[PDB]
Design a protein around this nucleic acid. Structure first.
Ligand SMILES: Nc1nc2c(ncn2[C@@H]2O[C@H](COP(=O)(O)CP(=O)(O)OP(=O)(O)O)[C@@H](O)[C@H]2O)c(=O)[nH]1
Ligand SMILES: Nc1nc2c(ncn2[C@@H]2O[C@H](COP(=O)(O)CP(=O)(O)OP(=O)(O)O)[C@@H](O)[C@H]2O)c(=O)[nH]1
Ligand SMILES: O=P([O-])(O)O
Ligand SMILES: [Mn+2]
Ligand SMILES: [Mn+2]
Length: 1095
DNA sequence: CCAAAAGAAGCGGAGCTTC
């Protein structure tokens, strides 16, 4: 413990004494940090970090010497050096702003004078930066080493933070704003996704600052300072960036949206550099100079990423040896630029790519306001992908003369749901634009004979890219569908691309050519197909055609099928056998493929099946209210409105209802995963209203083209046969909107009753400003809920099985109950430590606990089995980071604003998270992990969770391996894993110790509704043990089912497209049998196995 | 439903208050 002397030698003039027990001013920087055993940052010890790093950046030679390396990134050239010189000068500006901000803080309310007189201002929420100041005559000044290093971190954050932010969707924006997800105004999601919240901005900035300071946290120092000091620095730097206009602050007033929402929420947006800024070609020079082991960098050639030790954002969970092996395998894969696609993108240019793939140039007077905001968001995503691709390309271009031969590696980590996530927002796994320019897939094909297997592979890739659903038809049938398309509608586009691949030029009408040819087949991968086919046509040597074109093996209705296989717990039923076949589990059909199943046996997948069951439930609901004309009319109007605007709903002339799989796809999925019906109703309404607002733009565009067009032809001209037709479609719309907003169904004692809202929609429609307001949205949702979603939910249960639903319920309940106890006990042990600390004269409220103290509290939870283990994966369902544990501000800026809450890694309630955690984890997660690590693991692939892109040379074997990996995952038993954790929990939990809040939360899960009011401790303890019994029985059933299934002849084609099924070679032959016969035989084998347990 | 949380700001020196 010579760590006190060490850090004092480096920072001898900081104000105060590095002694927690001292009477006067105590220095909490020196008390909180220590010098590392091995250098982490090259700025430690530097008198002037900004000067030193600026010199290092001033030339290649100086950079190489400072970094103690032989050769710098070749992207670090003259133009880039000049830009960094200018950026360093800007660093001086930020430093100067910070110094003045400190001066102002010291002067205001005499804080500096009081601090000098012994007022412990350095322990205030806004004064923690006084721990990094030094006496300066009658005042104080920043330690220059710490300030300048922090500014360097600030500059790196400014350059690359935006590219590393998370994506905000509707759920995220609802949590942030506190506005019900279904009622979010159009473009609010887009507004919030483009900016950072205060916590988002400060936490990322603070991480950078602490990293560059290059020290280690003292485990016996309070988090109020270890986390507090760098956060305080970050808050000041964010404030400085607002002053400099590097960051724009927008305080968004929620009361303008919902008058009873008091929240005012800060959004921070970094000012974007020019797309042509040379700094874009190497944006991490600072990072790679300051840090001995940089995080932010590209991995070129044989520079490979390290393997992460812990689960993403879950430091309590180590990646298992098998997970680390999978990560290593994926990080080993080489990606390469496909020059033709880069040149194609480049030649079209950003504007034309936006026109083709986004919304083009928006003119805000032919657009409905709400629709205009969605179109803005669509442009943003495409533009950001384009810009990010070309920044990467500029860096790749510097590495070699031939960009197509520069290997690129990507870092991955395991998420909390066991998926291998490629890090970054704009990479091949996450961004479709990028996916068609940077690829690991490569093959040299013999395309000289259209009868070759190589040519068949080529065709499969092209067809899939062109939106032919290749898994639904045999290879032979696919081939003919592709040929017709290539020689038909696509031919003018192919001709254009042939010319491009000859002269390098595109015509002025290139966008129109592609649009007209592709129609609804338009996608980035479709562009790759047109490119590659045209390249083949002009190829000199068709016998050795080199292409990155791929085939994606993708899981057919993957999550739902995995749940059905992994968690169905009773005896076998013929309906389950038929339905699981829809997912590619074929019993008694050696070598059967999904392609054959779809073409000869059953053309309806699981989602289509549930749609059919919805149609039955709907009929039953109508019969229950046959004599009720108001109810019948209300149902009619809902279905009418959906028919008007949604592609997956169709009503025939005589009233015949037709539904496509698309309406059930997400609802079925998220229902299994614990979604309420209300949320689904909200999403369906949003899809309807999206289409309405778009149709309103179609109106404004029709009126501009023709001022004497009728409202009926302006809104329904493109949709109608004649004009009288457009008139009856318009009448429908107005009638539907009136009744669906003025009247709502309410359930009263199991009966639906119509009620007047009093807030019905009436008035002339102004297509420009037209917006369906909150109360009217609520009414649409209520109609959608009771007349569509409830029937759909009934259909869902019928399709996936009541047995599965039961398993998922018990899983949810157990994991929720456990998480409630974990959360409450953590909080109680925290409050108990804080009551002790309140006796410590060295401790002040706002100082929190130490890391050791928190580590001890987490370790004390271990007899409650917080972790779920499978043998190859670890899940921590309760793991979170939240502000509710410390319930206090961590730091503010020096203006008493930017008040960052103190967030702590702690267990929190799971809610329904246990279901998707376990289903995604032991399903697609385990499948991919197995694919990366199994004997003969396919090489040169890109994995996208339940889909895998395969090079054309290896489509057969890699597909068969994928199906084998499915079979391997289907040997799992997530319920058994949950049970083993819950069983340990149950023998160590003391329900009497729980707070009243925790006991109430467990009551909801463990008890029937008529039990919460009067709940005793012993009642809910008894109820919790009952769930343990339920889990044990389900787990036993699953085990038997898997064992029995393994004995039988199986052909598995869940990872479909190629027609390469995995055969388990089970010896019991169930061929030439109905599902009823099969179920009987399987159940005989079940009982036989069940009687083997007994004895 | 899940894969990441997440109000601001005066006065005063924490945390109540009001918007
Ligand atoms: N918890 C959630 N999981 C989702 C959601 N969307 C997709 N997924 C998961 O990813 C899985 C694969 O998604 P895909 O895009 O391939 C669609 P899916 O496989 O369900 O059916 P196909 O259309 O046959 O591919 C899916 O089955 C779910 O387990 C979602 O909104 N929430
Ligand atoms: N857990 C979740 N996974 C998702 C969700 N959305 C997408 N995904 C996963 O990411 C994969 C890619 O999603 P995309 O947006 O590209 C939809 P697409 O049909 O184009 O994907 P493919 O299945 O690869 O054809 C998807 O298949 C799922 O496996 C989600 O909301 N939750
Ligand atoms: O093109 P699909 O059939 O693999 O989705
Ligand atoms: Mn899928
Ligand atoms: Mn997929």
């Amino acid at each position: 413990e010579e760590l006190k002397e060490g850090i004092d030698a480096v920072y001898p003039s900081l104000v105060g004494t590095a002694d927690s027990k001292a009477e006067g001013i105590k220095n909490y920087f020196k008390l909180s940090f220590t010098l590392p055993e091995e250098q982490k940052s090259r700025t430690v010890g530097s008198e002037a970090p900004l000067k030193d790093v600026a010199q290092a950046l001033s030339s290649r030679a100086r950079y190489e010497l400072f970094t103690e390396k032989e050769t710098a990134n070749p992207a670090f050239n003259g133009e880039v050096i000049k830009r960094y010189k200018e950026l360093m000068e800007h660093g001086e500006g930020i430093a100067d702003i910070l110094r003045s901000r400190l001066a102002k803080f010291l002067n205001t309310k005499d804080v500096g004078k009081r601090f000098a007189q012994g007022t412990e201002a350095n322990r205030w929420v806004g004064g923690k930066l006084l721990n990094i100041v030094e006496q300066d005559g009658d005042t104080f000044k920043y330690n220059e080493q710490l300030l300048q290093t922090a500014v360097l971190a600030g500059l790196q954050w400014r350059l690359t933070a935006t590219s590393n932010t998370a994506i905000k969707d509707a759920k995220d924006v609802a949590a942030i704003t506190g506005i019900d997800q279904a009622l979010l105004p159009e473009g609010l999601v887009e507004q919030f996704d483009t900016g950072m919240t205060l916590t988002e901005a400060v936490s990322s900035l603070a991480q950078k600052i602490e990293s560059y300071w290059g020290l280690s946290r003292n485990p016996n120092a309070p988090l109020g300072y270890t986390k507090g000091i760098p956060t305080a620095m970050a808050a000041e730097i964010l404030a400085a960036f607002v002053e400099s206009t590097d960051v724009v602050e927008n305080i968004v007033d929620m009361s303008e949206i919902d008058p009873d929402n008091k929240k005012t929420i800060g959004l921070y947006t970094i000012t974007e550099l020019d797309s042509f800024d040379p700094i874009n070609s190497f944006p991490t020079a600072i990072e790679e100079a300051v840090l001995v082991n940089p995080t932010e960098k590209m991995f070129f050639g044989d520079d490979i990423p390290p393997v992460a030790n812990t689960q993403l954002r879950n430091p309590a969970v180590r990646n298992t040896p098998e997970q680390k092996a999978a990560l290593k395998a994926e990080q080993a894969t080489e990606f390469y630029v496909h020059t033709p696609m880069v040149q194609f993108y480049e030649t079209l240019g950003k504007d034309r790519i936006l026109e083709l793939m986004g919304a083009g140039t928006l003119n805000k007077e032919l657009l409905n306001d709400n629709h205009a905001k969605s179109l803005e968001g669509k442009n943003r995503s495409v533009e950001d992908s384009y810009n990010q691709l070309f920044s990467v390309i500029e860096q790749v271009r510097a590495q070699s003369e031939d960009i197509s031969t520069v290997p690129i590696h990507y870092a991955y980590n395991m998420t909390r749901v066991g998926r291998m996530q490629m890090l970054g927002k704009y990479n091949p796994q996450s961004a479709k634009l990028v996916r068609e320019a940077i690829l690991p897939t490569k093959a040299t094909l013999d395309l000289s004979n259209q009868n070759n297997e190589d040519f068949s592979a080529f065709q499969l890739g092209l067809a899939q890219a062109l939106d032919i659903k290749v898994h639904t038809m045999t290879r032979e049938v696919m081939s003919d569908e592709l040929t017709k398309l290539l020689e038909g509608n696509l031919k003018p586009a192919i001709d254009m691309m042939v010319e491009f691949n000859t002269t390098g030029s595109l015509p002025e009408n290139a966008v129109d050519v592609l649009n007209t040819a592709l129609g609804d087949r338009k996608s980035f991968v479709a562009l790759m197909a047109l490119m590659e086919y045209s390249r083949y046509l002009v190829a000199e040597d068709k016998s050795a055609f080199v292409t990155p074109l791929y085939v994606e093996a993708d899981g057919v209705t993957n999550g739902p099928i995995n749940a059905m296989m992994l968690m169905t717990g009773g005896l076998f039923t013929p309906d389950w056998i038929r339905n699981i076949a829809k997912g590619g589990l074929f019993i008694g059909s050696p070598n059967k493929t999904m392609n054959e199943h779809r073409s000869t046996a059953d053309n309806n997948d699981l989602y289509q099946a549930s749609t059919n069951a919805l149609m039955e439930s709907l009929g039953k609901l109508r019969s229950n209210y046959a004599s009720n004309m108001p109810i019948q009319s209300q149902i009619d109007s809902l279905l009418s409105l959906m028919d008007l605007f949604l592609p997956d709903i169709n009503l025939g002339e005589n009233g015949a209802l037709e539904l496509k799989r698309g309406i059930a796809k997400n609802p079925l999925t998220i229902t299994i995963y614990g979604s309420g019906a209300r949320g689904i109703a909200g999403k369906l309404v949003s899809s309807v209203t999206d289409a309405i607002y778009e149709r309103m733009s179609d109106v404004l565009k029709a009126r501009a083209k023709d001022p004497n067009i009728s409202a009926a032809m302006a809104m329904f001209g493109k949709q109608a046969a004649s004009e009288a037709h457009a008139e009856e479609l318009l009448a429908r719309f107005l009638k539907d909107m009136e009744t669906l907003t003025s009247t709502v169904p309410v359930k009263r004692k199991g009966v639906l009753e119509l009620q007047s809202t009093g807030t019905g929609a009436k008035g002339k429609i102004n297509p420009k400003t037209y917006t369906i307001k909150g109360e009217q949205l609520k009414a649409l949702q209520e109609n959608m809920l009771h007349f569509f979603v409830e029937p759909l939910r009934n259909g869902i249960t019928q399709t996936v099985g009541e047995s599965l639903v039961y398993s998922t319920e018990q899983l949810q309940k157990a994991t929720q109950i456990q998480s409630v106890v974990l959360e409450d006990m953590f909080k109680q042990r925290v409050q108990e430590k804080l009551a002790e600390k309140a006796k410590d004269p060295t401790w002040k409220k706002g100082d929190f606990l130490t890391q050791k103290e928190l580590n001890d509290i987490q370790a004390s939870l271990n007899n409650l089995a917080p972790m779920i283990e499978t043998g190859s994966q670890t899940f921590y369902i309760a793991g979170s980071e939240n502000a509710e544990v410390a319930n206090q501000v961590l730091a503010t800026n020096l203006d008493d604003r930017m008040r960052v809450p103190m967030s702590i890694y702690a267990p929190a309630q799971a809610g329904v998270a246990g279901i998707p955690f376990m289903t995604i984890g032991t399903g697609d997660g385990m499948m991919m992990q197995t694919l990366s690590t199994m004997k003969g693991a396919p090489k040169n692939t890109l994995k996208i969770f339940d889909g895998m892109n395969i090079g054309l040379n290896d489509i057969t074997d890699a597909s068969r391996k994928a199906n084998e990996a499915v079979y391997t995952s289907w040997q799992g038993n997530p319920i058994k894993n949950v049970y083993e954790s819950y069983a340990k929990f149950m023998k160590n939990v003391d329900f009497s110790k729980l707070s009243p809040e925790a006991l109430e939360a467990i009551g909801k899960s463990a008890l029937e509704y008529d039990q919460r009011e009067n709940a005793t401790v012993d009642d809910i303890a008894n109820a919790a043990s009952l769930i343990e019994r339920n889990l044990r029985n389900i787990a036993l059933g699953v085990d038997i089912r898997h064992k029995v299934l393994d004995k039988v002849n199986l052909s598995i084609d869940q990872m479909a497209a190629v027609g390469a099924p995995y055969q388990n070679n089970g010896k019991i032959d169930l061929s030439n049998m109905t599902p009823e016969q099969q179920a009987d035989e399987l159940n005989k084998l079940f009982r036989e196995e069940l009687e083997a347990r007994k004895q």
